[PDB]
Symmetry: D2
Subunit: 124 residues, 4 copies
């Protein structure tokens, strides 16, 4: 059996996400819920759109998703791999790119930040 994207996840920074069902083509949607980035009020929710690589029907697939922020002009992309570890726990190890909006093409060079995130299943 394989590492499944569908469901509820949580990270190290305290953000959560829900991913709906993965279609035949390898497609999925969900929502990204966060508490840190720049501002919000309290808790904010944004949609995510992604894909799971289905080649060789691997048990521990790679994937990618885009987060369309609703409270900002930015976009964030995540890519990683759905692993199985801890004693048999599912884990997502990801790396991301955060693109800020700049006003002029000449500041383009300073628009992209990078980092990681690790996700584990939310007690449920």
């Amino acid at each position: 059996r394989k590492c499944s994207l569908t469901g509820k996840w949580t990270n190290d920074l305290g953000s959560n996400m829900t991913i709906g069902a993965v279609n035949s083509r390898g497609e999925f949607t969900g929502t990204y819920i966060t508490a840190v980035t720049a501002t919000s009020n309290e808790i904010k929710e944004s949609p995510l759109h992604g894909t799971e690589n289905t080649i060789n029907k691997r048990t521990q697939p790679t994937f990618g998703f885009t987060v369309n922020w609703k409270f900002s002009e930015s976009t964030t992309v995540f890519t990683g791999q759905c692993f199985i570890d801890r004693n048999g726990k599912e884990v997502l190890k990801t790396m991301w790119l955060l693109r800020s909006s700049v006003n002029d093409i000449g500041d383009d060079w300073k628009a992209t930040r990078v980092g990681i995130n690790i996700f584990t299943r939310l007690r449920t």
Copy 2:
């Protein structure tokens, strides 16, 4: 007066992509065409899915998308901004993360590459 993602673009390496109509939620799909990476043959086509940010309806929006490679177990994600350049040309400036599949979670650390890509309109 409005950098649009819909269309045919080509890059700095020979790869091309075509993007469909963007819908009201800022969602789009498209196709990615290349021969790079490591696949000889002639040309391979893979699907892509992403979003364009609509907050504040900027004329030079940020966006993101994932390429679901059909001839590989990898995933590539792209993020950037659609700019109107000094000469009136539309230019996509992006950065990408290319995720390779590993067999052991232990090898995760070396699974991520990063680079840039510059796209220009081809549908002249």
Copy 3:
């Protein structure tokens, strides 16, 4: 009350490093010890050279350094900040770029990997 780089540290993967005294221009040298990457054997040691930023004499300075791999044609660069964590422990948080050698300039696009590393004091 002052995160210092001088010392012995270990990371999240088993690698260790020792850094010498930092001089008045913020310059330092040291050694990097590991068995990862892809080199079996037991343990290999490579030299490192870098700087610590002294502008404003912050207590949690940023720094950078390069590892000159002695058993490979590659180069790795690290950058981060030396923090004093909530519990009083010193912590190095860094990101790295690992550059592999290519034969043709044409293959440049795929030569760069990126990741993270967390260091903790070992010289207890």
Copy 4:
């Protein structure tokens, strides 16, 4: 004959650098001169410390260097490869990490930006 680091270089953004002689060990120093980043007055100069990988005495070596900014609390690291192309011109293709200084360990996630730079010899 090989691609040599020693000398004067210029980039795409309009910054310049001078690299002194490379010792036996593969070590070098130089200065980084820039006009864009955040502020300065007019033209600012900062020192750089790096290394050239000498394994297999390659003709087109990889290298890494750290830039110790003098007008800011940040640090930038560059890594890349010294190529030969254009009709036989020397070029440096680089990728970099820019670390900003943050006040608290909890904002660490947003401290690192990434990008590229291409350098060519300054008419001399």
